[PDB]
């Protein structure tokens, strides 16, 4: 503790040589490896590697796509890492043309297992999922090892390019007519109740709204139909205890000027999707609501 010591400006790591260089300068040994500069040393993004079988790589080779775990029963396949697109076949929001279009693309036993494990359970869909973030750097082999962002920006190694979130156009929705300068992206599963099964309808709802109470208040606007159908099923069936009718989870944010249409291009199959461009991921959690 000296007066000068508090007076010193904070010292940024680039000003000091790399710790490996600090050892090699002291001991002077020279390996073949180029430790002169460390890659990935400036990354506020936090990441995790997920092994995903080759039957699920389609439409994920493009960087930027949700990873969602899916717990199913059987102890051998403890989980399975669904894309957002693969979940669209089950959704009721998706166009039948788009659904039959992309359903052909998932003609693999690994993906068809996902439809079977979706049908299998009585308990609601929103329970089985846990969003993991977004694809980047597809390992692209007999079994892709996808790198997935938990927080921060999606971008290339070396920050040479910014990966963009891609959301299939039928799921994308906007409540408001005058977009704000910044707006948050939320993923919204909404059960509409029906006799044989309560079919889910997925959406992704960008909005400048941040407050939870005001957000759910505006949400019950469009979802009054599903909410009233839940109330009607509540009285139609005794000793049936159906729970929440939409579920919202904060998915991240984008600047609302970045939003614009595009298409994914795979197996010569154009797919119209909205494209948040500099989409920083900041995961939230599913919030039950009526």
């Amino acid at each position: 503790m000296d007066a000068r010591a508090v007076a010193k400006r904070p010292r940024d790591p680039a000003d000091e040589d790399n710790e490996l260089v600090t050892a090699l300068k002291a001991k002077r040994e020279v390996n073949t490896i180029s430790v002169r500069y460390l890659y990935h040393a400036d990354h506020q993004a936090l990441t995790a590697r997920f092994f995903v079988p080759e039957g699920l790589v389609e439409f994920e080779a493009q960087p930027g796509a949700l990873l969602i775990r899916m717990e199913t029963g059987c102890d051998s396949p403890r989980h399975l890492y669904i894309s957002l697109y693969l979940l669209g076949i089950r959704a009721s929001n998706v166009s039948a043309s788009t659904r039959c279009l992309l359903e052909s693309v998932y003609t693999a036993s690994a993906a068809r297992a996902a439809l079977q494990w979706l049908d299998l359970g009585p308990h609601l869909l929103h329970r089985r999922l846990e969003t993991l973030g977004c694809v980047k750097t597809v390992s692209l082999g007999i079994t892709s090892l996808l790198t997935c962002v938990m927080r921060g920006y999606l971008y290339n190694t070396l920050k040479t390019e910014v990966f963009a979130l891609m959301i299939p156009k039928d799921m994308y929705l906007t409540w408001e007519e005058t977009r704000g300068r910044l707006q948050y992206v939320y993923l919204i599963i909404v059960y509409d109740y029906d006799g044989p099964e309560t079919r889910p309808g997925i959406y992704v709802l960008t909005s400048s709204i941040a407050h939870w109470q005001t957000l759910v208040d505006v949400a019950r606007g469009k979802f009054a139909r599903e909410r009233c159908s839940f109330v009607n099923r509540r009285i139609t069936r005794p000793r049936q205890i159906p729970l929440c009718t939409g579920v919202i989870q904060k998915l991240g944010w984008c600047l609302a000027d970045d939003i614009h249409t595009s298409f994914l291009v795979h197996k010569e199959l154009k797919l119209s999707v909205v494209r948040l461009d500099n989409f920083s991921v900041e995961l939230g959690d599913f919030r039950e609501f009526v």
């Binding site: 508090v6 007076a7 010193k8 400006r9």
Partner: protein, 49 residues
Amino acid sequence: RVASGAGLPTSRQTTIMVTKYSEKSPITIPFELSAACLTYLRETFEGTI
């Protein structure tokens, strides 16, 4: 040990061993500096009276 007399039991010698132990008790004082104070310490603007 004192030496004993006739018909009285004698005294066996007794080595004794013992041990002390140290005890810890640290101290701490906080002192704080406003950022407005630090920013004039290191940054310096247009040098004016």
